[PDB]
Amino acid sequence: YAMNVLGNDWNKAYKKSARVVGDVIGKYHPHGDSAVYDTIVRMAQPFSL
DNA sequence: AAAAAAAAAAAAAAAAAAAAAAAAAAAAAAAAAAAAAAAAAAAAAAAAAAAAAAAAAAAAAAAAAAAAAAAAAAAAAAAAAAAAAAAAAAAAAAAAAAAAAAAAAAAAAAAAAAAAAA
């Protein structure tokens, strides 16, 4: 939801993980940046999902 | 073959550390002035020594400041309670010599392989 609200569309330039993690922690998910970045990393990997 | 403990998966909680770059301070370790202390020379004020002397303890005795007695009154110091400072007694400890177990080099000799001769 945070990535969709920011505008990280599949046909647009990449945004840094720091910005997305900061937006998620600030707005929606108050549980520390390291876990959120680990979830983003696992979602991005081609051998996990 | 039963019990027990490690480890790994992924979203969660919470931490820790190494360097660069300049300018100032603070420890901490050195050369190097600078003065005590000590060994070994010559040198020179003090004790000795003697004769010669006269200044202060004895002695008479008055008298004038005195130390014990009496009294009143003020209140310093001593011993008993508590409450802090500061030092030996005893025990503990981190590196540190001693011992024991695993990694790397060593060649003796042979299995398997590669290569070529007639």
From Swiss-Prot:
According to the record, mutating A35P results in:
In PPA-05; quinolone-resistant
Q: What is the effect of changing D38V?
A: In strain: 202; partially quinolone-resistant
The entry describes its oligomerization and partners as: Heterotetramer, composed of two GyrA and two GyrB chains. In the heterotetramer, GyrA contains the active site tyrosine that forms a transient covalent intermediate with the DNA, while GyrB binds cofactors and catalyzes ATP hydrolysis. Can form a 2:2 complex with toxin CcdB in which GyrA is inactive; rejuvenation of GyrA(2)CcdB(2) is effected by CcdA.
Which family is it part of? Belongs to the type II topoisomerase GyrA/ParC subunit family.
Additional detail: When the enzyme transiently cleaves DNA a phosphotyrosine bond is formed between GyrA and DNA. In the presence of quinolones this intermediate can be trapped and is used as an indicator of drug toxicity. The enzyme-DNA intermediate is also the target of a number of topoisomerase poisons, including toxin CcdB.
Domain note: An N-terminal fragment (residues 1-523) can be reconstituted with GyrB, but the complex no longer has negative supercoiling or ATP-independent DNA relaxation activities, although it is capable of DNA cleavage; ATP-dependent relaxation is inhibited by novobiocin and non-hydrolyzable ATP analogs. The fragment has ATP-dependent DNA relaxation and 30-fold improved decatenation activities, unlike holoenzyme it preferentially binds supercoiled DNA.
Instruction: Quote the protein name from its UniProt record.
Output: DNA gyrase subunit A
Taxonomic source organism: Escherichia coli (strain K12)
